[PDB]
Each structure stands twice: as C-alpha cells, then as structure tokens.
Amino acid sequence: MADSTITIRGYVRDNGCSVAAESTNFTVDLMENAAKQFNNIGATTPVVPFRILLSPCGNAVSAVKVGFTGVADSHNANLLALENTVSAASGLGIQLLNEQQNQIPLNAPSSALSWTTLTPGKPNTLNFYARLMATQVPVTAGHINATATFTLEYQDNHHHHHHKQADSTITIRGYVRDN
C-alpha cells in the first residue's frame, strides 16, 4: 500500500524533504540501446519512465528547483557523459529529460530549469524520462555507465550558503548492441 505522514506528527524539516531510498539510491534500467539506430544527432530512443520520489517530507513547501550535475560530454555538454573508458561507447551521451521531453543540462545552476509545487508529506513524484542521445555517428558497441546527482534547490529562505543537498547518485545501465 502507499501511506505517509501528512498534517500529523513526526515530520522532518517543513521547507525541504528527505529524498527516499527509492530515489537517492537506485539504478535506471535503460534497456539495450543498439549501435545501429544512432546514425545522427536527432536519434532519440524509446524514452524510459523515470522519477525521483521525494518522501518523507514536512508540511510547508512552495516548490523547489532541480540541479542535475555530472560529467558533461564534450559534444553537447547538456548530455551526461559516460564513465569515459574504452568499453563505454563513444558519441552516445545519456539523455535525462523531464516529462516535457525537454533537454535538461547539467552544469547549469538551478535557474535554467524548475520544479512542481510540492505536496506536503507524500511520495512527491513528478514524471521524468531517461534514455540515450546520439551526439555523433560512432556506432562503436560498448556498455552504458554514467554518474550524476540531482540536487533539489528547496525553496527555503537560503540563510546559509547553498551546497549539494545530497550525493543522490544517479546510475544508469544499458548496452550498445552491435546491431
């Protein structure tokens, strides 16, 4: 079942959330990715459903902003680069997007993107996508291995200087088939 503390006792900081284990500490199954389909920069795979469940949360929030940051690729640094090893494929950045299928950069600050009005005390789930972007036509087979974190720039009054919220490590798997 799905039940949570809302408008009741035992709530964390109001302005913020905890981030669930289901979001700070998981793996995206990007399925297979095929070399043979990435034959120009427009090439965009069947965008897998992905979310960051925030819970438990407190009782007073107004929204956040995201802050995704990772190793950005040389080609289009808006795409999350791979582990950068011989066995990681070339010219195939990770394509992390929101439900609007809009390219989300990394090393932007929290200003170039946004978030929804958080509900208090619930498994606050927006809907996002992850898949695999062609930045070139290398079609060298290999595996999918990346690392970033999201921060949430919680709309607290920012009295202390900002940092990362967490080290909520986004890991994505997958496989470039040679067909």
Swiss-Prot record:
SUPFAM superfamilies: Bacterial adhesins (SSF49401). Pfam families: Fimbrial. Belongs to the fimbrial protein family. It comes from Escherichia coli (strain K12). This is Protein FimF. It comes from the Bacteria. One of its GO terms (biological process) is mechanosensory behavior. Disulfide bonds join C17-C57. InterPro entries: Adhesion_dom_fimbrial, Adhesion_dom_fimbrial_sf, Adhesion_dom_sf, Bact_Fimbrial_Adh_Pro. Gene3D superfamilies: Fimbrial-type adhesion domain. Involved in regulation of length and mediation of adhesion of type 1 fimbriae (but not necessary for the production of fimbriae). Involved in the integration of FimH in the fimbriae. The record marks Y154 as: Required for stability and transport. Keywords: Disulfide bond, Fimbrium, Signal. It is found in: Fimbrium. GO terms for cellular component: pilus; pilus tip.
